[PDB]
Amino acid sequence: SSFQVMYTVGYSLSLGALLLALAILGGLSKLHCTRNAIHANLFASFVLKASSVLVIDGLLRTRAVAGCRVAAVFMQYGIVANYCWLLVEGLYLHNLLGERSFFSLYLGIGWGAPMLFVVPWAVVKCLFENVQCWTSNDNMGFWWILRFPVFLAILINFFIFVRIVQLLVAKLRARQMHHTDYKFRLAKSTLTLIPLLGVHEVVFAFAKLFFDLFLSSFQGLLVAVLYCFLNKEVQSELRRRWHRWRLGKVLWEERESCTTASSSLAK
Amino acid sequence: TRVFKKASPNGKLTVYLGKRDFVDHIDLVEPVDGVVLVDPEYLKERRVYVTLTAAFRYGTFRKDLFVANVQSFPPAPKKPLTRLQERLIKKLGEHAYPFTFEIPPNLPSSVTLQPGPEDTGKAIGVDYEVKAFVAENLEEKIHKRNSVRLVIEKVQYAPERPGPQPTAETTRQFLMSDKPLHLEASLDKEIYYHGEPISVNVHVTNNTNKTVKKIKISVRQYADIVLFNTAQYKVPVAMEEADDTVAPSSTFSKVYTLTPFLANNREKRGLALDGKLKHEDTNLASSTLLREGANREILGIIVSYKVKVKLVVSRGASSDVAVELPFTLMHPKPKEEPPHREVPEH
Amino acid sequence: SDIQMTQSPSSLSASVGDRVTITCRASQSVSSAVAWYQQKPGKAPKLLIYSASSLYSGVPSRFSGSRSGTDFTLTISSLQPEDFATYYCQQYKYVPVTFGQGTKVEI
Amino acid sequence: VQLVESGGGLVQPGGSLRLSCAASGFNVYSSSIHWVRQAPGKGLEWVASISSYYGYTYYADSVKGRFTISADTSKNTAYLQMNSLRAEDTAVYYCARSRQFWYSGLDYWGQGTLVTV
Amino acid sequence: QVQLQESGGGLVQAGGSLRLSCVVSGFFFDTVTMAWYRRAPGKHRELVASATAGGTTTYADSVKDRFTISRDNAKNTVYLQMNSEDTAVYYCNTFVRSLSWGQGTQVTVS
């Protein structure tokens, strides 16, 4: 039924769209841009979470204690890092509207401290509650030790979100960056990702269950299109490459006369 | 005191041109002069048309940029005669009908792209052509045997007043902060004559922990070839490298000599070369001047030359810091006339 | 086919101030690639006129060259006392780069 | 603007002699170097020419293939490696200079080296 | 390649006659306007006598009532005769000066 074919389809195009974004954002004229240094790492967190999801489903279909050992550990870390690096982007807009020491701090929020709070969950497996592989349907004794960072990150994300709307409205009220191509473009995509993803997790935490399965599946595609496909700067670069390729082909496809003499002039 | 002729295949038409090249200024273009001779008992059509057209050859087809219509009919409905034009009329007689042209300013120069190893025959590039034919009406077809096809080239020369010397500075820091990597370079002059050496002075100091690998020096020629859509091209006409390394907390200063020439660039497809009459070889088509704030919608090849210096670091995976210095390379002002062929003919 | 150029005057004697004419007949047809060189006894040659109509920088204005068809000629208005030399013709329109037979001038 | 050369030494049939011509004040890529041979008492004669910009080498019919001419950029010098000289080669060699672009004849000439075989 | 084979001319006395001939190979005479160019003891070749296929014996103002011209397409040649300062070398080309020039022959009027 739709519980399986649709479930694997939703993640099927997530990696394809995200990996295509990685190829585009990997090497171009803006490979070292600070703006793209955050989006590229955000896609990696989505790829890491999505990759661990697909292998878990395949292993269950085939059926191994050791087989799921590699898959599940990054799955729980990826979803936590997904929200942790989501706060990184939110603070980036606040710093932009308010590199250097920020880059070190931003890395610690996304790929730093959350790794320190995900290890204790993975550490206590042989000590207590091994229950073969993880199922996440047992008693809540081991719960809320990994759900705290994502709940905390959502709460802080709203604090910046409330601040950012008032700052932009006040600034745009009297000239300033009313229709700029740099601050507005980042804020337009930020204004949708933080609330919609934030309210999805908290509301469903406390046929409804089936309706929330593909919502997370499209999160990777939704982020990629709003950050890479919708971005105007890359489209100009993409059009330049497309025009150059088209022009190069056109100039190099494979598919009586009397000699000029001379005469003496009166002077 | 010499003119150029091109007889018609039937021998009933010939167009006299004083010079085969015309100087293009910032906003002024030298007018095209000359006369056309038609023998009696042949002007029954009562219409002589001399047309100057510029077309972009690609692949093949001709994309006409600008087309001029001048009629040399015996009625000839002011156009004061130039001294060169008047001299031709007196020698030939009263049967010569003078014609004149007024090329609009801000037009692409005669530049032809260099063919690659896989030759395609006709050379792709912007070419100016002057043709004369006789027919009853304009819509009537014109045969090659009953017309002439004289090719002319529009060229530009370096201004008499050199501009300021190029100079630029850049600084890049990666994830370590403080102790900036200073890098700056300069050129002796903005305008360089053809064949003259290009000397660049580079001053690099590296106070950071990361070392500096070999320095890359290259000269890049940009061809803004647009006929349907804009597409900038990059060609390293000159390239030389040195294995000099910059130690941490040290200052480096050296001068590198560069020379752009096509002796080793004959195998580089896509290079832009000056106007070719029939098969002669030109020399690294010069840059095209622009009238300051002019529109960039010119449908043609625009040539610009720049110098790029690249330094790669070892990162303790390698990153490069590059600053580009534009420069001008044009021919000087000819005294008598430009020889539009190889002077030593074998 | 090779091109051979002959200089009709081989040697002549003249005083100071007379009008001396030196002609040079060419076998083939050369548009303007004609140059004349001066040579003192035991001295390096020096260019006098290029393109058969132009004048080189630093050369005295008394020298003048004219072209009428194919017999390029060089004319000197006043023969200065130190102007004696041997004049050599040249062509640079073809590969051979053929020189003239020379015209020795003495006072 | 000044060209200096030595080209000294007795020459025997079936031998070789390398001529070094130093060029100062100008480069090679914008100035084609020509060598002119003048027999003692006879007229001038052109033997070889080098165009480094276009990479073209030209030779006289009588000396085709016998001589070797090359130029260098580091020191801006023109070399004329002649091999297997015949009896009819006693003359004076001049290192003429011209313009690579807008050719206007040989304006600068070398001092002249006497070669006797 | 066009062979401008012209013959005729030499030592001529005052009031005499000197027939001139010219044979052109590799070209058609159906519709061409001959011009019969003549040089001067100096330079600056001028026009003397122009004649098309049918009539139209256009003559230079200095040679009226002294020269005669004729043309024959069948033999593929052009003929010029003179009766009675005119000493110069004669050339032969069309009115448009399309064919290549030749050395020609020179006549002397004594």
mmCIF file of C-alpha atoms in Angstrom, chain B residues 194 197 260-263 266 281-283 331 334 338 342 346, chain D residues 27 29-30 34 52-56 58 73 99 101-103:
data_model
loop_
_atom_site.group_PDB
_atom_site.id
_atom_site.type_symbol
_atom_site.label_atom_id
_atom_site.label_comp_id
_atom_site.label_asym_id
_atom_site.label_seq_id
_atom_site.Cartn_x
_atom_site.Cartn_y
_atom_site.Cartn_z
ATOM 1 C CA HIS B 194 52.389 44.539 -29.988
ATOM 2 C CA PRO B 197 57.453 42.633 -23.217
ATOM 3 C CA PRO B 260 52.062 37.538 -25.941
ATOM 4 C CA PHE B 261 52.676 35.787 -29.259
ATOM 5 C CA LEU B 262 50.955 33.148 -31.379
ATOM 6 C CA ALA B 263 54.024 31.065 -32.283
ATOM 7 C CA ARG B 266 48.663 28.095 -33.220
ATOM 8 C CA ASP B 281 48.050 35.449 -40.615
ATOM 9 C CA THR B 282 47.391 38.310 -38.196
ATOM 10 C CA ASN B 283 48.786 38.910 -34.695
ATOM 11 C CA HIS B 331 49.342 48.459 -32.525
ATOM 12 C CA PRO B 334 51.330 53.626 -38.907
ATOM 13 C CA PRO B 338 49.516 49.132 -43.000
ATOM 14 C CA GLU B 342 52.972 39.092 -45.166
ATOM 15 C CA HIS B 346 57.439 32.811 -50.265
ATOM 16 C CA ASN D 27 63.510 42.390 -28.426
ATOM 17 C CA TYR D 29 59.481 39.050 -31.117
ATOM 18 C CA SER D 30 58.922 42.615 -32.392
ATOM 19 C CA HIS D 34 68.083 39.173 -41.012
ATOM 20 C CA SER D 52 60.277 34.468 -33.756
ATOM 21 C CA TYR D 53 56.809 36.027 -33.458
ATOM 22 C CA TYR D 54 55.333 34.060 -36.373
ATOM 23 C CA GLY D 55 57.782 31.147 -36.138
ATOM 24 C CA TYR D 56 58.831 31.387 -39.792
ATOM 25 C CA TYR D 58 63.478 31.591 -44.642
ATOM 26 C CA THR D 73 64.773 35.312 -25.578
ATOM 27 C CA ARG D 99 60.491 45.367 -37.804
ATOM 28 C CA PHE D 101 55.205 44.379 -37.724
ATOM 29 C CA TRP D 102 54.961 47.068 -40.420
ATOM 30 C CA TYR D 103 58.100 46.016 -42.279
#
